[PDB]
Design a protein around this nucleic acid. Structure first.
Ligand SMILES: [Mg+2]
Ligand SMILES: [N+]
Length: 439
DNA sequence: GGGGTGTGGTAGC
DNA sequence: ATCGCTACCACACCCC
């Protein structure tokens, strides 16, 4: 065990945090896309009629953790047993579960304790450990396979296990469902072979949003082709409201109240007016949902096809540590902030940039919340606080940045013992050019 | 028209 | 035990 005041805490937490892995993996995939395309210009123009293939592993962590399980899980059966991937036993997140487990109602993000309560007596939950390096290896096979197929004009990384693949269709070619289904089965089989046993599902359509919905329809271990001209009540009746891209629990609640608790996209589709939509959830999100309910992408979503080099360019840099934060005095808080800045400046130097504005955010124990929350080392119920500084001259100097960060902390007046989480951000990044002569 | 701030929601497993 | 990250958009509200 390494406590938050140990010099090794950042390294050990990040080594264990699957959420840190997700964001870090997505950041390298973006960087890699940019480097592989420094001189290629493989982007989508208005001249292009395109097909979107949205590809995603099925229960990625659970699958890979199963396939690479240790000897003590040899007789474990991925098709018959309910499997979760998780660190602990009680208030530990279920990062991923297999479709057996989901058939009992278990869902990603549940705590293990919760999921156990849903099995019938005699059914035992299998808990596999994370296999992070293997998660990465299987992801590499994924993207390598996607490129080797030579069937896509643009391959966009969404995550470690997810990509949006664009195929341009010449006007002198008449695309058919049968060609599409066959591409889908090629991709599925090749990736199965290439990952030594992982399965992906695929949504295939003439919009991002439709391909996203098709993909959830395809799961598990299948594919679905639904083009705009195929839309139907049966399609929209298949989806819950937060199946819409951009609709999370909070948008959901607003939508449910405004619209009499729709229970499907078909329900919502028949009940809404764009203007009451905008009123309920906001103008831009409201227009995005309205567009989506026609199978259509909005302008914001289209940018990634039109100028992917720009969309995928990293614009800010930060760390968030809201677990294991237990400091007894301000000297230990200041040292942790210094370690944090050191870590960020390393990342910032890899990408050869400076920062001109930084932010510190913190979580503070709510006055009525227990000192030790239900989740071991959790942040629990907190109030958040944030404050930022413009630096003026962009910099990568530890002295300037760490000093300002610590000052930003003092500004927020959170007693060390009340502190439960910290975020350190470089919000505005500045390129470093060969000319550094300034007076 | 331009700018700024802090806060909040979402996405991946 | 247990590892509740991180980038980005949007918004509400403030200024000249
Ligand atoms: Mg959603
Ligand atoms: N999963």
């Amino acid at each position: 065990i390494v406590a938050c005041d140990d010099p090794d805490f950042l390294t050990s937490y990040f080594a264990h945090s699957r959420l840190h892995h997700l964001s870090a993996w997505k950041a390298n995939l973006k960087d890699k896309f940019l480097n592989e395309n420094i001189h290629k210009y493989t982007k989508i123009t208005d001249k292009d009629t395109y097909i979107i293939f949205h590809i995603d592993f099925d229960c990625f962590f659970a699958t890979v953790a199963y396939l690479c399980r240790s000897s003590s899980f040899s007789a474990c059966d991925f098709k018959r047993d309910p499997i979760v991937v998780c660190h602990g036993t009680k208030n530990s997140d279920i990062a991923s579960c297999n479709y057996v487990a989901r058939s009992y109602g278990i869902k990603n993000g549940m705590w293990v304790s919760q999921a156990e309560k849903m099995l019938p007596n005699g059914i035992k939950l299998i808990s596999l450990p994370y296999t992070f390096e293997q998660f990465q290896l299987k992801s590499e096979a994924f993207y390598s396979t996607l490129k080797r197929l030579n069937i896509f004009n643009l391959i966009l990384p969404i995550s470690i296990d997810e990509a949006v693949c664009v195929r341009i269709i010449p006007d002198n070619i008449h695309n058919t469902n049968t060609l599409n289904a066959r591409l889908c089965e090629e991709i599925r089989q090749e990736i199965f072979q290439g990952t030594n046993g992982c399965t992906v599902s695929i949504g295939c359509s003439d919009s991002l949003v439709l391909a996203r919905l098709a993909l959830k329809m395809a799961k598990p271990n299948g594919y679905n082709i639904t083009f705009k001209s195929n839309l139907s009540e049966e399609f929209w009746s298949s989806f819950k409201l937060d199946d819409l891209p951009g609709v999370g629990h909070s948008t959901l609640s607003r939508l449910e109240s405004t619209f009499d608790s729709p229970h499907s996209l078909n329900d919502l589709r028949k009940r809404y007016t764009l203007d009451a939509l905008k009123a309920s959830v906001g103008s831009k999100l409201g227009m995005k949902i309205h567009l989506a309910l026609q199978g259509q992408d909005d302008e914001e979503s289209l940018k990634i096809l039109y100028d992917p080099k720009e969309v995928l360019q990293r614009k800010s840099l930060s760390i968030d540590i809201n677990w294991g934060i237990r400091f007894k005095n301000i000297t230990q808080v200041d040292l942790f902030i210094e370690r944090g800045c050191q870590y960020l400046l390393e990342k910032l130097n890899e990408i050869n940039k400076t920062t001109s504005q930084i932010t510190l955010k913190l979580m503070r124990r709510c006055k009525d919340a227990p000192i030790e929350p239900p989740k071991y080392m959790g942040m629990g119920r907190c109030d958040s606080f944030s404050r930022s500084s413009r630096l003026g001259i962009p910099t990568n100097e530890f002295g300037i940045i760490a000093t300002e960060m610590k000052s930003l902390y003092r500004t927020l007046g959170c007693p060390p013992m009340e502190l439960r989480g910290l975020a350190l951000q470089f919000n505005k990044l500045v390129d470093v050019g060969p000319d550094n002569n300034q007076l």
